Amino acid sequence: NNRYSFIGGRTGQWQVVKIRNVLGPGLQLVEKVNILNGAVAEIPLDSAWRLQGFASNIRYAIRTELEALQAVEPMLNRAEAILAVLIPIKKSAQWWEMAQDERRDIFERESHHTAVGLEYLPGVARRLLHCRDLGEEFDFLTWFEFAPEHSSAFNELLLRMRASKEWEYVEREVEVWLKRL
Amino acid sequence: NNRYSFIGGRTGQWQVVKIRNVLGPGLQLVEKVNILNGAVAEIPLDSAWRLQGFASNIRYAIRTELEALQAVEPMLNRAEAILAVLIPIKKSAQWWEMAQDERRDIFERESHHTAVGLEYLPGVARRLLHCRDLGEEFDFLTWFEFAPEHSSAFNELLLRMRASKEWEYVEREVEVWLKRL
Ligand code: HEM
Ligand code: HEM
Ligand SMILES: O=N[O-]
Ligand SMILES: O=N[O-]
């Protein structure tokens, strides 16, 4: 199954370290986050929110970039990757109205998204889920996990991405920092 | 709502004229197709199958191409457009593993999908729905409607599309011809 759900509440495999309401309406603070593979129609009792997304095909990356990423990208669930960050993101309607070449030019030519992110591998593992087409309040659920030694590097990366032209189209953003239980 | 459901059965707004099983497993013959805006977890009692897809953002079309289509494409629900064709399509795993630049090269550079399709406007209205990310047996639900006087032109377009490099990656196709009731 390509669907994944993220349940904010009192149970889960991940302990919430903090929630930073970066931009727009935030997410209610909770004790844990439970990650399930599949959809969850029955939102658990004693649970504050539910985020769901699906893995999908590549949308912007080209062959040379995929080869670069595939050459260094770390696997998920490394023994040492005990910190994780779940960053739901929403982009503006103006972004989704643009043609494919316009969005690619902003994504890479202007923001150099992949080139910048490649500088922080193999320290950080990542997973990208889509959820706009599901009608969710967010468009993407991004997931990053890494060892504590790279926490400062991840914060650096966040600052660099948040100054890019691409992020001028971001309308809602939240950071949920997690600790592997 | 961006989700659309197509129920094959004994009720609906469209009458099935014929079902041609072009490639792979087919669709059971039914009297009518019922189109519903929204998801449908409960397939009606007197129905054979259920297809669902969602409208999504542009994945390949360039700005200049979108401008060319927007200048000639007709709207849906024209009084004259009493014929419709619903063509579910599945593409091979080899297609989905390719990078964005590779898939775009096959779609337009080699197959000229959009240049070829533009030659049959404004006769043919169209709607593209995505369903692979929903876990459906098909990847796309394509919809076309037109006046009977264009039926020969549409068939010609089918033969042209099926001879393209893009269609070498198609591994399941069905044509459901419909008449507005
Ligand atoms: C850490 C290293 C990173 C790498 C290697 C990386 C790489 C990529 C690549 C190659 C894509 C394109 C996927 C596709 O073609 O479909 C992508 C998409 C995306 N990334 Fe990252 N990225 C990184 C960090 C981040 C961070 C820190 C964030 C958010 C804070 C982020 C948010 C996104 C979003 C929202 C998308 C979807 C873009 C869209 O479809 O509009 N990425 N990333
Ligand atoms: C009749 C005139 C047609 C026009 C103007 C046209 C135009 C287009 C355009 C511009 C796209 C790109 C959508 C995007 O960028 O997201 C597209 C996608 C697609 N079209 Fe057509 N098309 C036509 C006919 C057809 C026919 C007859 C079929 C099937 C028999 C078809 C099947 C598809 C499929 C499966 C896709 C999605 C491909 C993918 O995303 O991998 N089209 N069409
Ligand atoms: O690729 N950003 O999760
Ligand atoms: O061109 N898909 O309706």
Task: Please give a structural write-up.
- Chains A, B: One of its GO terms (molecular function) is heme binding.
- Chains A, B: It comes from Cyanothece sp. (strain PCC 7425 / ATCC 29141).
- Chains A, B: Its cofactor is Fe-coproporphyrin III.
- Chains A, B: Pathway: Porphyrin-containing compound metabolism.
- Chains A, B: This is hydrogen peroxide-dependent heme synthase.
- Two copies of one chain form a homodimer.
- Chain A is globular and about 45 Å long.
- With 181 residues, chain A is of the alpha+beta class.
- Chain A has five helices and eight strands.
- In chain A, strands 4-1-3-2-8-5-7-6 form an eight-stranded antiparallel β-sheet.
- In chain A, strand 2 (14-23) and strand 3 form a beta hairpin.
- Chain A has one domain (1-181).
- The interface between A and B is medium-sized, with 25 and 25 residues.
- One nitrite ion binds next to strand 6 of chain A.
Note the beta-strand portion of chain A: 35-45%
Coarse structural class of chain A: alpha+beta
Largest sheet geometry of chain A: 8 strands, antiparallel
The set of bound ligands, ions and cofactors reads:
protoporphyrin IX containing FE, nitrite ion
What's the helix-strand series of chain A?
EEEEHEHHHEEHE
How far from one another are the termini of chain A?
24 Å
What is the tally of beta strands of chain A? 8
Largest interface summary? A-B, 25 and 25 residues
**Domain unit count of chain A:** 1
Pathway (chains A, B): Porphyrin-containing compound metabolism
Protein name (chains A, B): hydrogen peroxide-dependent heme synthase
Cofactor (chains A, B): Fe-coproporphyrin III
EC number (chains A, B): 1.3.98.5
